[PDB]
Amino acid sequence: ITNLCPFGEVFNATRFASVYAWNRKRISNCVADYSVLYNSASFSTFKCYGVSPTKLNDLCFTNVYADSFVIRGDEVRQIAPGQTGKIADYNYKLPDDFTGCVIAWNSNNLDSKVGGNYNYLYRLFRKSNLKPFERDISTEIYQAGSTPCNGVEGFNCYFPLQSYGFQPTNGVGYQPYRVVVLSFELLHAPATVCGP
Amino acid sequence: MQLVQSGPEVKKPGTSVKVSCKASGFTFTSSAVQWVRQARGQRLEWIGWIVVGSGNTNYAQKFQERVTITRDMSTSTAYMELSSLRSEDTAVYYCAAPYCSGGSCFDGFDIWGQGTMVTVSSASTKGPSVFPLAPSTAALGCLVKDYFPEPVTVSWNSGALTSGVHTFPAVLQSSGLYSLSSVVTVPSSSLGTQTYICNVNHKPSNTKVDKKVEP
Amino acid sequence: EIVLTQSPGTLSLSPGERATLSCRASQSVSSSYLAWYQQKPGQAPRLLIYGASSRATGFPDRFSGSGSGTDFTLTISRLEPEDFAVYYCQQYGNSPWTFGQGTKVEIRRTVAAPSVFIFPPSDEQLKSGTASVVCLLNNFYPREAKVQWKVDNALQSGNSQESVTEQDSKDSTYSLSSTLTLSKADYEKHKVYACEVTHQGLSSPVTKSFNRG
Ligand SMILES: *[C@@H]1O[C@H](CO)[C@@H](O[C@@H]2O[C@H](CO)[C@@H](O[C@@H]3O[C@H](CO[C@H]4O[C@H](CO)[C@@H](O)[C@H](O)[C@@H]4O)[C@@H](O)[C@H](O[C@H]4O[C@H](CO)[C@@H](O)[C@H](O)[C@@H]4O)[C@@H]3O)[C@H](O)[C@H]2NC(C)=O)[C@H](O)[C@H]1NC(C)=O
């Protein structure tokens, strides 16, 4: 008879995470109906290197890590094995030789409306270039000189985060494109998420 | 480690203006840029700083209005529009930046430019009205006046006779015109001998005025 | 916020200086958010000491000074005549990031006396631009510079133009000239001009040029 784990509620909703405080939902012990995302779908740019989209339902990995992101139109391509840009260098990073799928669908509506939204800020100005799979839920004034400012901003001492100033009247390569990354795992553990 | 700026712009009394500082030789992705004011024989007034890694800006008490910066991330440049231009804004705008490469960088504003030259005049690039200084143990020279603000140079007929040439700076006139002078002290008591030349060029309105000074 | 007004004005002595300059402050500013630029005639400034606790990457040696908050003092110790230009203090931290008045420097010369001379406009001045007469005093060192006049049968100083130069690196002199511009069309109420320069080392000059007309 089977069932279906709440995969879609991660995919559809009004308020999606952020660029740096990105949600990462673990999904296990379910029959995730992958047929709904490729066989009958209206999602642009469903290129999800790592496993062939066909017969995805007949191969199953250990645990699901569902992600969620909001990116400008042009900056969607930064999801790649490292590459360049302000994603995967200070934002969430894609590990090298990673195996999992990536989807990016336009969201000009459904909570992307007039006015630079209060949330949806960058994650910028980190002293290091991050490590894969680690999550940045911390905020503090950056270091950009000899003396460390003691908590009061001024010369240098940049605040890391700046808001996305988008709206439903923007261009073509700058409108929001909500991004979902389904991360598999390859390890010595049995596969949990399985089923037709 | 270089930073070039655009040519001297010319405007009208209260239309607009925009200046360009190209940043090169240092990582412009995560840095800061500042803009200042200057003049002839005057002080310096800080105008507005640009965190250029991510745009956030303030302005001085006289520059909160009529001014706003422009990011232009690509081409590694910087712009700011000044509106409602006033006559007393004949300024070299300059720009500065810290040497940043990698995420942490030098405090002192060390990377500078050279600036432009904006003159909000009637813009009638009228030809200079120049005249010789007939010598009266003395000196002798040339007179330049009544011309649009323009880079002007003075030769002395040999690449020489620079034995006391005194090229005084440019002073604005009542209507926005410009004037200066170039006087050379005599090599000796050579009053009754030889001929001199007031060789002067003018680059925008191409002319080569040559007046041979003699008593 | 802006009461800095660096105490020194113009100081003049050849190498052999222990001179110091002061950047007084309104409120004691936190150190290492300071700077001390160095403007030059006709160029862009530089950076010497970035916060009264170090020295910049690479620049000529033999001077480095530091101070307190309300008194961010600095010193120079026997620097070459190359470094004789206008300085400019600075502040960071609180917007607006204000600069300072700036300090000026000079050189001793043991001021001498010039040769005075007058330049009459040629006979073309009936149809030329402006009936202006030209004078030039040569090589005054001191800051003070005053010129007066008593033109032939006219008492008004509406228009007068002056031109002065900066330091001369060869001999450390200042030189300015006087070319007064007045009414052109008349050429009849002002003929025998006066153009005088005053100094203790020059006493009372005489300048009654050739009778025009
Ligand atoms: C999260 O948010 C997304 C939005 O991005 C939702 O996606 C939509 O989901 C709904 C419901 O799942 C889809 O609605 C579907 O509409 C069909 C309309 O019928 C068409 O097809 C028939 C032929 O099958 C034609 O004859 C007809 O003219 C129409 O062209 C319904 O028929 C569908 O019902 C199906 O299921 C029932 C129950 O099993 C069957 O009995 C039916 O026969 C039929 O097979 C269905 O209701 C909608 O299309 C989706 N939007 C898309 C694809 O853009 C997600 O559902 C939401 N939730 C989750 C968990 O992801």
Author numbering:
A (entry chain A): 332 to 527
B (entry chain H): 2 to 52, 52A, 53 to 82, 82A, 82B, 82C, 83 to 100, 100A, ...
C (entry chain L): 1 to 27, 27A, 28 to 212
Paper lines:
(Right) Structure of the RBD and B1-182.1 after local focused refinement. The binding modes and sequences of A23-58.1 and B1-182.1 are very similar to those of previously reported IGHV1-58/IGKV3-20–derived antibodies, such as S2E12 (27), COVOX 253 (30), and CoV2-2196 (31), confirming that they are members of the same structural class. To understand why B1-182.1 is highly effective at neutralizing the emerging VOCs, we compared its binding mode with that of A23-58.1. Analysis indicated that B1-182.1 rotated about 6° along the long axis of Fab from that of A23-58.1. This rotation on one hand increased B1-182.1 CDR L1 contacts on invariant regions of RBD to strengthen binding and on the other hand critically reduced contact on Glu484 to 6 Å2 and main-chain only compared with ~40 Å2 main- and side-chain contacts for A58.1 and S2E12. Overall, the subtle changes in antibody mode of recognition to regions on RBD harboring variant mutations provided structural basis on the effectiveness of B1-182.1 and A23-58.1 on neutralization of VOCs. When compared with epitopes of class I, II, and III antibodies, the supersite defined by common contacts of the IGHV1-58–derived antibodies (A23-58.1, B1-182.1, S2E12, and COVOX253) had minimal interactions with residues at the mutational hotspots. Similarly, B1-182.1 escape was mediated by F486L (frequency 21%), N487D (frequency 100%), and Q493R (frequency 45%). Q493R had minimal impact on binding and was not found to affect neutralization.
